[model samples]
Target: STGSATTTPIDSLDDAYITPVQIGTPAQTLNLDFDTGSSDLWVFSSETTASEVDGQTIYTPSKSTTAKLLSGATWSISYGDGSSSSGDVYTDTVSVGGLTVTGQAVESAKKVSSSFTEDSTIDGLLGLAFSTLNTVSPTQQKTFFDNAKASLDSPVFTADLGYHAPGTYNFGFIDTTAYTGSITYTAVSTKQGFWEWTSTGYAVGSGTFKSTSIDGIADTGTTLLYLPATVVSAYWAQVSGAKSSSSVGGYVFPCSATLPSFTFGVGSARIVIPGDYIDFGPISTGSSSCFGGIQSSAGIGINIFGDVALKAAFVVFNGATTPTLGFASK
Candidate 1:
């Protein structure tokens, strides 16, 4: 079966992309962040602490006829930014767009961090990463995509992210009209649960195509493009007043700095992110300095091709026995 959903950017900086998800018997619709970086379909629910919830819609399992408690099951997850959430587990009919998975394990959040509480647009996350990373203990559960893939028209999904606009996520089939030019498919290493791949090379703006290979994870959940210190230094060097600020926690530049487009390769295919996207957003409410979309990945250890880069192209997460990634200019 084929199904599709529209992913809408939640903030001006495209901080997160949210998509609609339905759970339980009659269907309780909630806006969930469709994250490719992590594995665990968790939600804000009745079990959540009353003070922890902000404006998020909660799923009440007790009110659903199809909801069944997963006996003795529990889960907890921590994000790269130090935000965390923990919960109990239940099985319910979970649907995304038109794709439905009966008895899908739905993690219900009992406690959440302040970061998640303030993000009112996101009720929770629908993890599309490898199910091996699922945090359920005693009996690890499959991700929503893993359980739904078998019955899908094809064991694959595509993320067509947008810049300050709504994009599409399709399951089971690729949307031919969504992208231009031929797709460049690459090998994906999912042993670590992430949709990891290597970028052939990258170029800053209209300059040279440095043919250096960089291994990184394609993470839809993350907000910035994190590269090696060398690459990040080179990019920031192009800006006159750009500097790594201890107070700001990252490289920041004058808000008026002339930003340059960033280009990365997937074989012959080159995805170019516009200069304005690299400008990111202002560091403070009315600050003259702005944070960059690209940052150093030194502390994180693993490089990440986050939403800042992914939004520039159409990315295919092909979940075959031997997994692969497909990138195309859009």
Candidate 2:
């Protein structure tokens, strides 16, 4: 799981890891957003005026002789958080991590709203979410994976998020040292395209997930795990001195000196979330700090196993070759 910051910066070349994407045939170098929360690729283009596309980096299709515009096609997207952006439809050959992908799909933002526009440091989002999240109509929406899957040697794609420093965030390689168990597959839900499954159970030391308790769903988009208050309390109780508090988003706690290592059992595969991930910060509120890992989301429904929880495992979404998901260690 990669680190989620409040805001990420962008430029033609500065701040964060920017993957190179090509638009159209001749191929224009477009800076695309590598997002796991959603699956869609978009970019700003020549038709977009400087003022309308302010702050965000706009990809000049004209820069690449191979770039092509999709005449008469327009597009817009609304995110789960009520944030949305609109632009014209365009086609391009996009590339990332030195891997060349052909006939790639991208978006050209001509006019974006204030909420999306304010965070415009980045040019566009390269959604790494599953292809099922592709909002494009069945007749038209094509995803980066859809277009480039056949070209990859394996049917798998992995996100190797490294340290928050230069040369990190390797997109194409899988790191195999993060979990403990044989790879397992919980069939993908055809209706929503969201990967959902009930954990067979969980274990920290010898404790197992109660059969009545709901299982966890891994999600890279969210920053923290959202669990039922009852479950949250029970899980923290296992950790010695881990207190419950309101200031830390209703999560459990442990004294700085009492941090405990815990593991959640997914079938026979055991995933461990290091103690550091639980401690939000020493300076933050609450004497015994726990990263806002588990919060009260019982009524919200659907347990979310967010990024902080995922950092403990090497997750591989094997879609291109095999039609199943695989988990390893990093």
Candidate 3:
């Protein structure tokens, strides 16, 4: 099936997860998307009153050459897809990709997301994912790796990308030669910002279960991989001659046959999903027809390894050093 795992390429926007800071008060420059699956950071301000936040790249402390403000404090953040914003809370001098960190902490939303309403290239979202899912704090707070973590010497932060740029996703620093082996970490369970986990079941090709159980949260903005309709009916009852057809709302299977290899063991790392993303999504019901990887999420919380399990590996959201998450094997 077009082997080398599809020519073994890996450069989805430079394999990202970055963090660069510097926000307001004589300073206003940014480069973010250090999203560990959502913490919140959305730029576009100038005391915005939202008309879609004018001509993008906001954050003007009177045309800052360096700006600083946080005197009274104010901030708001939301996004579970419903989208939301609000701002005020600043501090300046922040950099990543040259790595300079001084008084970071920035968020000037004021109200945004009209796709950032004007798109001045880049202006916000430094959220390093989670540190209790920050929204600013106690008398001026920050989160660009909690202040670039004592000037990182190796407090780790790499996300290089440019393999012909498939959307180039870069971050602070991480390129241990793009990994060759060893890197299985996963410990950060406070559940303040979402990175939750607990999956140790589900398999098809290699057929596995390993004491079955599944929990969720590993959302790269989510794109699908939210099992648990009883583990999607115990993985389509182990696909014995898999059926299901017509789909796109849930379940879809068609196989020329011999398609089984679904591993999903996170915590020693084992995320192999590749059964045509569940035979191509949608359709199920068993007269002996089932495909979908479990559907319906009206329940709200559980299961989510989106982007179809992050395209299958090399995901290290180091959080500037290591809040924990480094699964290399691609």
Candidate 4:
């Protein structure tokens, strides 16, 4: 059987999408971020110090008779934004929509970094990446998707993310009606434990497309789009008042400045990010300065096609033989 869940953006932050999931025997529901960037299903729990958790909901495994502790098993994860979480492990029944996975590994957080603790809405994270990236020690654990794939009608899932709107994540089956036009397929390289792919070329606004190969990962957990320093500089140059701001830590421009759309090539297909989307709102409250969504991926070797870029297109994460990515205009 197939399953689907509704995903909603957190406030207007545009950073991540949250979906409802049930864990344990009687099924305790929690709002979880379906992260494609990391592989660890962790949540704030009774194990966490009361002072460490604010408004976030905690999972109480003791209430679920089926919850089993995985002795000596532990997990820790650090994100690109420096947000981190560490916890002990438990085996429980997990369900998303109507799909259920028995004996799914659930990490109960004992500690969390300020970044996560400050975000009260996100109770946990449900990792959709390959199980090999799982951070559990002693013996690596399998993700919910990995454990459910064998029973799914198809081993594929699609991420329909939106900007300050609601989207749907479908598992085991694709809802062709959810997308329009034909989907352009591209091979994915999982060597890095991410859905990594190379773009044929890119262009800033209506400028000429350059034949430069760009390698990057399609990360759903990330909020902004990140490219090479040279590419980032070229895009901002087109904006009259745009300049790199060390204080802001990225390119910023006058709020009234007209922004140009950015486009990238996937084989022969071109995925365009609208100009307004590039203007990631004001840098601060009542500030006339606005931050550019496209920034430099300098230190991180690989570029990242985050929410700003992905929301403009319909993406398919195929888990079939030779993992592949399919994209199309929404």
TM-score to true structure, per model: 0.99, 0.73, 0.31, 0.97
- Order candidates by lDDT, high to low: 1, 4, 2, 3
Candidate 4 stretches with Cα past 4 Å from truth are none
* CA lDDT of each prediction against the hidden true structure: 0.93, 0.56, 0.54, 0.89
CA shift of 263, model 3, Å: 4.1
Give the per-residue lDDT of model 3 (tens digit) for 87-118: 77666665544455565556666666665455
lDDT of 1 at 159: 96
* Candidate with the larger lDDT of 2 and 4: 4
Give one digit per residue, the lDDT tens place, for model 1 in 214-329: 99999999999999999999888888999999899999999988899899989777899988878777898999999999999999989999999999999999999999999998
Q: lDDT tens digits, residues 13-111, model 4?
A: 576789999999798999999888788999999999778898998899999988999999999999888789998999999999889998999999999
Better candidate by TM-score, 3 or 4:
4
| TM-score, structure 3 vs. true | 0.31
